[PDB]
């Protein structure tokens, strides 16, 4: 079996959907091939918070921002190793990308809530309805069906087809045990995501991130797009720069979005019943703090008063059920019971919380200088969750220009080949800031579809 389209996109995350919608809108034929039985990749299970300087939400909330500050925050976040033009193009197109999600894809964002991730000087992360990528992928899917963009699931790209001039002209993929050839008349877009779930590739480029760590990502995040492109001499860079997320399941590796109560007053308690890090410190600081605690894990503790403002339990009920079944989370009436279920010393926990309650009343955290203010924890019920860092995002990957064209080992454009999203390696330097992956995947996914369709 063979198929022919103008634009063949590999991957059904935010980058691939953005490329596909743009290629169809340009009047070209296009397909997305997706190796899993379901669409959306890590973009689906993402928090999907998306940084934008100058958004309609910031305006509603009276928050001023600037592209210059977003650029400088981003470059500094990655230890000044990111490509400045890639960061500039991401920031310059972020407003348009978010307005396009709103107006064309019909993604609903809260009009009056934002997250401030570590390294950001102002609150700037837009929040999709539901606080996950479910809203984004479900709306992308509906729009794709409306506009006539086909998505072939259970179809794994295995080889790029390169003609005698060096142009990439198609993809060989596996489906139901057979090879299918996808001819691409105008371009191939690699939108395959990262390699957080490829243990051997992690260990090759960053030996510390071995079997001691889980992955927050889906099973399909295995680096296939880098491997396929390297076979035709695409360059890669920054492959050793791999980040973890601090608050993840010790059993499955999954992120704990339910623990976004950390942004609303939840406290981090170690096995000794003590507070050990400011709960809103920079992401890697929190991870390193947790790894310095007994057992290399933390507890996250909060109450109903926090849930009534944060809604992270209501929004992440699958996590509640799974973490509870795994013995990693408990809902308890009292602090005494919270200590009992996890063998935390009771007197130390109670003394810690007495201090928290005082700091909440005064607004002055005399132990860790919590930046936004603690909330009284004297009254339950409470959730307590056990968490540890897990591998989360691979900042390295393919070398592209700001037009998403993939470059070879001498910096020459490989005709017909584009790449966008976490598969690329030039935007985030040594360390991606929270909320900046979604900005990257939409901005560059759109550009890739536009360029491939030319």
Ligand X SMILES: Cc1cc2nc3c(=O)[nH]c(=O)nc-3n(C[C@H](O)[C@H](O)[C@H](O)COP(=O)(O)OP(=O)(O)OC[C@H]3O[C@@H](n4cnc5c(N)ncnc54)[C@H](O)[C@@H]3O)c2cc1C
Ligand Y SMILES: O=C(O)CCc1cnc[nH]1
Among 143, 283, 370, 446, binds Cl ion (CB under 5 A): 283
Scanning residues 183 to 212, which ones bind ligand X (CB under 6 A)? 191-193
Q: Does 64 bind a copy of itself (CB under 8 A)?
A: yes
Q: Does 279 bind ligand Y (CB under 6 A)?
A: no
Q: Does 436 bind ligand X (CB under 6 A)?
A: yes
Q: Does 246 bind ligand X (CB under 6 A)?
A: no
Would you give the binding string for ligand Y spanning residues 39-78, x where CB under 6 A is met?
--------x-x-----------------------------
Among 107, 437, 443, 452, binds ligand Y (CB under 6 A): 437
Q: How far apart are CA 190 and CA 72, in angstroms?
A: 28
Q: Does 289 bind a copy of itself (CB under 8 A)?
A: yes
> Which of 63-71, 104-112, 148-156, 326-334 is the region at the interface with a copy of itself (rule: CB under 8 A)?
63-71
Among 25, 36, 63, 72, binds a copy of itself (CB under 8 A): 72
Among 257, 268, 269, 349, binds ligand Y (CB under 6 A): 257
Would you give the binding string for ligand Y spanning residues 306-325, x where CB under 6 A is met?
--------------------
Among 82, 425, 435, 445, binds ligand Y (CB under 6 A): 435
Among 225, 397, 435, 445, binds Na ion (CB under 5 A): 397
283 carries an active-site annotation: yes
Q: Closest by alpha carbon to 365, among 262, 263, 265?
A: 265
Residue of 28, 202, 275, 283 marked active site? 283
Would you give the binding string for Cl ion spanning residues 378-417, x where CB under 5 A is met?
----------------------------------------
Length of the chain equals 454
Q: Does 116 bind ligand X (CB under 6 A)?
A: no
| Residue 397 binding partner per list Na ion, ligand X, a copy of itself, none, with a CB distance cut-off of 5 to 8 Å that depends on partner kind | Na ion
> Tokens 């109560």 belong to which residue?
261
| Residue 214 binding partner per list ligand X, a copy of itself, Na ion, none, with a CB distance cut-off of 5 to 8 Å that depends on partner kind | none
Of 244 and 352, CB closest to ligand X = 244
CB 362 within 8 A of CB 351: no
| Residue 227 binding partner per list Na ion, a copy of itself, ligand X, none, with a CB distance cut-off of 5 to 8 Å that depends on partner kind | none
Report the 3 state secondary structure along the chain: CEEEEEEEEECCCHHHHHHHHHHHHCCCCEEEECCCCCCCHHHHHCCCCEECCCCHHHHHHCCCCCHHHHHHHHHHHCCCCCCHHHHHHHHHCHHHHHHHHHHHHCCCEEEEEEECCCCCCCCCEEEECCCCCHHHHHHHHHHHHHHCCCEECCCEEEEEEECCCCCEEEEEEEECCEEEEEEEEEEEEECCCCCCCCHHHHHHHCCCCCCCCCECCCCCCCCHHHHHHHHCCECEECCCCEEEEEEECCCCCCECHHHHHHHHCCEEECCCCCECCCCCCCHHHHHHHHHCCHHHCEEEEEEHHHHHHHCHHHHCHHHHHHHHHCCCEEEECCHHHHHHHCCCCHHHHHHHHHHHHHHHHHCCCCCCCCCCCCCCCCCCCEEEEEEEEEEEEECCEECECCCCEEEECCCCEEEEEEECCCCECCCCCCCCCCCHHHHHHHHHHHHHHHHHHC
Q: Does 117 bind Cl ion (CB under 5 A)?
A: yes
Q: Enumerate binding residues for Cl ion (CB under 5 A).
A: 113-114, 117-119, 282-283, 434
Q: Binding residues for ligand X, per CB under 6 A? A: 10-16, 33-36, 41-43, 45-49, 156-157, 191-193, 216-217, 220-221, 224-225, 255, 393, 421-423, 435-438, 441
The footprint of a copy of itself (CB under 8 A) covers 64, 66, 68-69, 72-73, 76, 79-80, 121-122, 276-278, 281, 285, 288-289, 291-292, 364, 366-369
Active centre residues (catalytic): 283
């Amino acid at each position: 079996m063979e198929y022919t389209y103008d634009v063949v996109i590999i991957g059904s995350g935010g980058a691939g959907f953005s490329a596909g919608l743009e290629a169809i809108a340009a009047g070209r034929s296009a397909v997305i091939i997706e190796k899993m039985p379901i669409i959306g990749g890590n973009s689906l299970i993402s928090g999907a918070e998306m940084n934008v300087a100058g958004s309609w939400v910031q305006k509603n909330m009276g928050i001023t921002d600037s592209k210059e500050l977003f650029i400088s925050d981003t470059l500094k976040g990655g230890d000044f190793k990111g490509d400045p033009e890639m960061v500039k193009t991401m920031v310059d197109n972020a407003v348009g990308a978010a307005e396009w999600l709103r107006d064309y894809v019909k993604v609903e964002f809260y009009p009056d809530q934002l997250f401030q991730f570590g390294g950001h000087s102002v609150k700037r992360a837009l929040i999709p309805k539901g606080h996950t990528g479910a809203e984004v992928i479900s709306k992308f899917s509906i729009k794709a069906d409306e506009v006539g963009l086909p998505i072939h699931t259970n179809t794994k790209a295995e080889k790029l087809i390169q003609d005698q001039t060096g142009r990439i002209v198609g993809v060989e993929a596996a489906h139901n045990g057979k090879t299918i050839t996808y001819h691409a008349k105008r371009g191939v877009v690699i939108a395959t995501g990262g390699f957080s779930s490829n243990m051997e590739m992690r260990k090759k480029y960053n030996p510390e991130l071995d079997e001691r760590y889980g992955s927050t990502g889906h099973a399909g995040g295995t680096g296939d797009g880098i491997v396929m492109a390297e076979k035709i001499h695409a360059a890669a860079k920054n492959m050793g720069y791999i980040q973890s997320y601090p608050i993840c399941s010790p059993t499955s590796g999954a992120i704990a979005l339910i623990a976004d109560s950390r942004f609303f007053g939840a406290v981090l308690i170690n096995q000794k019943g003590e507070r050990f890090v400011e709960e809103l410190e920079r992401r890697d600081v929190i991870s390193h703090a947790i790894l310095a605690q007994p057992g290399r894990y933390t507890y996250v503790l909060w109450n109903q008063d926090i849930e009534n403002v944060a809604h992270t339990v209501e929004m992440h009920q699958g996590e509640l059920k799974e973490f509870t079944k795994d013995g990693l989370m408990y809902k308890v009436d009292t602090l005494e019971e919270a200590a009992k279920v996890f063998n935390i010393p009771e007197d130390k926990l109670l003394s810690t919380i007495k201090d928290v309650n005082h700091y909440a009343a005064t607004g002055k955290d005399e132990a860790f200088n919590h930046r936004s203010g603690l909330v009284d924890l004297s009254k339950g019920p409470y959730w307590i969750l056990k968490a540890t860092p897990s591998v989360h995002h691979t900042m390295g990957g393919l070398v592209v220009d700001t037009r998403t064209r993939v470059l070879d080992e001498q910096g020459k454009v490989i005709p017909g080949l584009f790449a966008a999203g976490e598969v690329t390696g030039l935007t985030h330097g040594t360390n991606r800031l929270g909320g900046n992956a979604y900005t990257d995947i939409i901005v560059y996914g759109r550009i890739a579809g536009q360029e491939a369709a030319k």
